């Protein structure tokens, strides 16, 4: 059934033409023009369902009609016929769902969503699983004297919001650097990022002190050694170094020529807080090493920024679009709609808008 939703979703996406004004749309908005349909008390879902519409979850951080969201309710409305098709083809299907990179969720059967509802669909274990390949992360945290204040408290929050985006195939470690360098975790190599092993990291990160002098050369040279150590038992995939520095005038040019000649380590760099320092070199480290510079003003931007780092890791997958569509099942988790333990099957939907004609291909 996934192949049917992935084949139609892409087909409809090609004929779209990007409407800009919207004086013509009518979706459901399951959190409360719009619809108010009939409900059947149904027992496979243990709950009231509709069977005639898909519902929509737009997270309450987003929305007014902003034409990125509002345009994506347009072409996604087509998946209505194919959601409805699969109930007649085989009953006892549970929630079909199209998640989307802008945060919406269409899910048939439509149903009232369950004070604040946080629920970003783009950080759901069933999305961060079939949206990238497994990941040998390594988090470097500038713990020098210059991070103290606000911009440290944002790092202790943001690592704890970073590590939630790891599945159970992914590996991490957390390493501070300052005068010298050290893996303030009690592990000294790469771990498994279980439920349990991520808790040791959340007590190590929350007891960071801030003092010393930045150097960036004893730091990165400790980072590329950790992404060696083949001894361990890593996953052998996307190698990521992520950098939670505030600023500094140091292009570490002597280090990436030492270790990244083959360009096989993506370096995402974040620069947190409202420091008035030089963001110049930190933007440089990420645009030489296939990385992507992000920026974090304050609390609140943390939930949106530390999930867009998976759109970079999807870049190798989209270039093999004939054979990257495997189905990738997620290992067991409790449903957000109150259903029980559920296991999901996922499949990515990629943007086909010039193909076989090929095109500038932007």
């Amino acid at each position: 059934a996934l192949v049917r939703l992935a084949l139609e979703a892409e087909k409809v996406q090609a004929a779209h033409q990007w409407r800009e004004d919207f004086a013509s749309v009518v979706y459901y908005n399951a959190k409360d023009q719009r619809i108010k349909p009939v409900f059947i008390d149904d027992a496979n879902f243990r709950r009231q369902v509709s069977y005639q519409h898909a519902a929509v979850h737009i997270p309450t951080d987003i929305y007014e009609g902003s034409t990125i969201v509002l345009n994506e309710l347009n072409w996604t409305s087509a998946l209505d016929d194919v959601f409805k098709k699969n109930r007649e083809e085989d009953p006892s299907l549970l929630w079909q769902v199209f998640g989307s990179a802008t945060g919406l969720a269409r899910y048939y059967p439509a149903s009232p969503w369950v004070k604040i509802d946080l629920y970003d669909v783009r950080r759901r274990p069933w999305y961060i699983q079939g949206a990238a390949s497994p990941k040998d992360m390594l988090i470097l945290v500038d713990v020098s004297g210059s991070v103290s204040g606000l911009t440290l408290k944002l790092i202790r929050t943001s690592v704890s919001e970073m590590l939630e985006t790891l599945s159970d195939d992914d590996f991490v470690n957390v390493a501070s650097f300052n005068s010298n360098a050290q893996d303030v975790s009690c592990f000294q190599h790469l771990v498994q990022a279980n439920v349990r092993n991520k808790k040791v990291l959340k007590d190590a990160v929350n007891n960071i002190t801030a003092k010393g002098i930045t150097d960036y050369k004893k730091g990165f040279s400790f980072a590329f050694e950790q992404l060696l150590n083949y001894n361990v038992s890593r996953a052998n995939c996307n190698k990521i170094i992520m950098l939670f520095t505030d600023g500094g005038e140091e292009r570490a040019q002597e280090i990436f020529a030492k270790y990244n000649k083959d360009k096989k380590v993506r370096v995402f760099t974040f620069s947190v807080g409202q420091h008035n320092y030089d963001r110049g070199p930190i933007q440089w480290m990420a645009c030489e090493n296939k990385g992507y510079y992000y920026e974090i003003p304050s609390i609140g931007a943390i939930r949106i920024n530390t999930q867009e780092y998976l759109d970079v890791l999807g870049r190798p997958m989209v270039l093999a679009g004939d054979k990257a569509k495997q189905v990738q099942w997620t290992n067991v988790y409790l449903d957000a709609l109150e259903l029980g333990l559920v296991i999901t099957g996922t499949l990515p939907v990629f943007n086909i808008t010039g193909q076989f004609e090929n095109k500038t291909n932007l």
């Binding site: 390949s133 995939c237 933007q283 990420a286 645009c287 296939k290 992507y292 510079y293 870049r315 093999a320």
Partner: peptide, 17 residues
Amino acid sequence: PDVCFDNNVLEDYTDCX
């Protein structure tokens, strides 16, 4: 798992920013 996907020749890294 056995699949995995990394480092095509194309890609074209000219965004970041």
